[PDB]
Write a protein that binds this ligand. Structure first.
Ligand SMILES: O=C(O)CNC(=O)C(=O)O
Ligand SMILES: [Mg+2]
Ligand code: NI
Ligand SMILES: [Zn+2]
Length: 331
């Protein structure tokens, strides 16, 4: 079995190997990459997402989210407080202000220490989940706006035609902006490209150990757990690496830099934070190997997690028994 310790693997495809996305994902998996839950892909040196980032300031962040924490430094929840719209130019200026900028630090490890020590005492503003793309339409390889759709994958594997579309989303981050512990909707893959700016640190639990994370989370967030059998779908819970180590949860960590892709694999729990002003683009995707995970994915039926139009059909076809109860939560 390849990669039995479930280490995060880093790939360096040639421009020739960068031509066929599906085939490269399948290659990564042949090397055991999926066992970690997360892989890094460094694009060939000849590749570019677009020519420059000089003209992005007039993108609108219609609902910036202020991430307010509660709890203790290692174990906290965050809620998202809606703020007034601002442009990317305005947001970048805010990220760089004295109140929100990245503090002096030695290296990534020192900054990680400062994040976990100090995250809860600040409320950074996140521009999340903005429909759109920063890939040039002439970028042919690994253009997240041109991937095959999850609906076409389900049709090709299962023969059923369903409604829904699949488009990318932009994330504008600042120091301390945080992604809580989660798997993707319907335990899909995700791909994330860091277009510009400061790095993003990731933590991930191997898929084969996801239930160990879930068990800890139910112990650490006992009221949330009673309210909903899949509360990590709410994307509000944070658990530090120190706490995971104290509780013997297997995990790994890696820092993504501008110009690098990360791939999350089905049922790979992940969480992380941004180092400073940045812009990432991400999209969910599927492969044949996803199907069985989609069939077994937990669902939030308490009504908090409130998810896309396209998830309907996935639950309807892959999880017909759940459908009824899940749609009662979604309506
Ligand atoms: O970039 C972020 O804030 C979080 N991204 C993801 O969880 C992802 O790409 O799966
Ligand atoms: Mg613009
Ligand atoms: Ni994710
Ligand atoms: Zn729920």
């Amino acid at each position: 079995a390849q990669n039995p310790n479930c280490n995060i693997m880093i790939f360096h495809p040639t421009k020739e190997e960068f031509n066929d996305f599906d085939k490269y994902i399948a290659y990564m998996e042949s090397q055991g990459a999926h066992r970690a839950g997360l892989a890094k892909i460094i694009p060939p040196k000849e590749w570019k997402a677009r020519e420059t980032y000089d003209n992005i300031s007039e993108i609108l962040i219609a609902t910036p989210l202020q991430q307010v924490a509660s709890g203790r430094a290692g174990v906290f929840t965050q809620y998202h407080k809606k703020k007034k719209a601002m442009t990317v130019g305005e947001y970048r200026h805010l990220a760089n202000s004295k109140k929100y900028q990245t503090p002096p630090h030695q290296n990534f490890e020192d900054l990680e220490r400062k994040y976990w020590k100090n995250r809860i005492y600040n409320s950074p503003i996140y521009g999340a989940d903005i429909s759109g793309s920063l890939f040039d339409e002439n970028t042919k390889q690994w253009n997240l706006g041109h991937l095959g759709t999850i609906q076409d994958l389900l049709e090709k594997e299962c023969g059923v035609v369903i409604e829904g579309v699949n488009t990318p989303y932009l994330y504008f981050g600042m120091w301390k902006t945080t992604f809580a512990w989660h798997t993707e909707d319907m335990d899909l893959y995700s791909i994330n490209y860091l277009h510009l700016g400061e790095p993003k640190t990731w933590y991930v639990v191997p898929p084969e150990h996801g239930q160990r994370l879930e068990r800890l989370a139910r112990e650490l967030f006992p009221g949330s757990s009673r309210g909903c059998g899949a509360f990590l779908r709410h994307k509000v819970a944070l658990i530090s690496p120190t706490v995971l180590k104290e509780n013997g949860i297997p995990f790994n960590r890696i820092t993504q830099e501008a110009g690098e892709f990360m791939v999350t694999f089905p049922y790979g729990y992940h969480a992380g934070f941004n180092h400073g002003f940045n812009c990432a683009e991400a999209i969910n995707f599927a492969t044949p190997r996803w199907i069985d995970y989609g069939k077994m994915a937990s669902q939030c039926s308490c009504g908090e997690a409130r998810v896309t139009f396209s998830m309907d059909a996935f639950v309807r076809i892959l999880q017909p028994e759940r459908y009824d109860l899940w749609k009662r939560g979604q309506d």
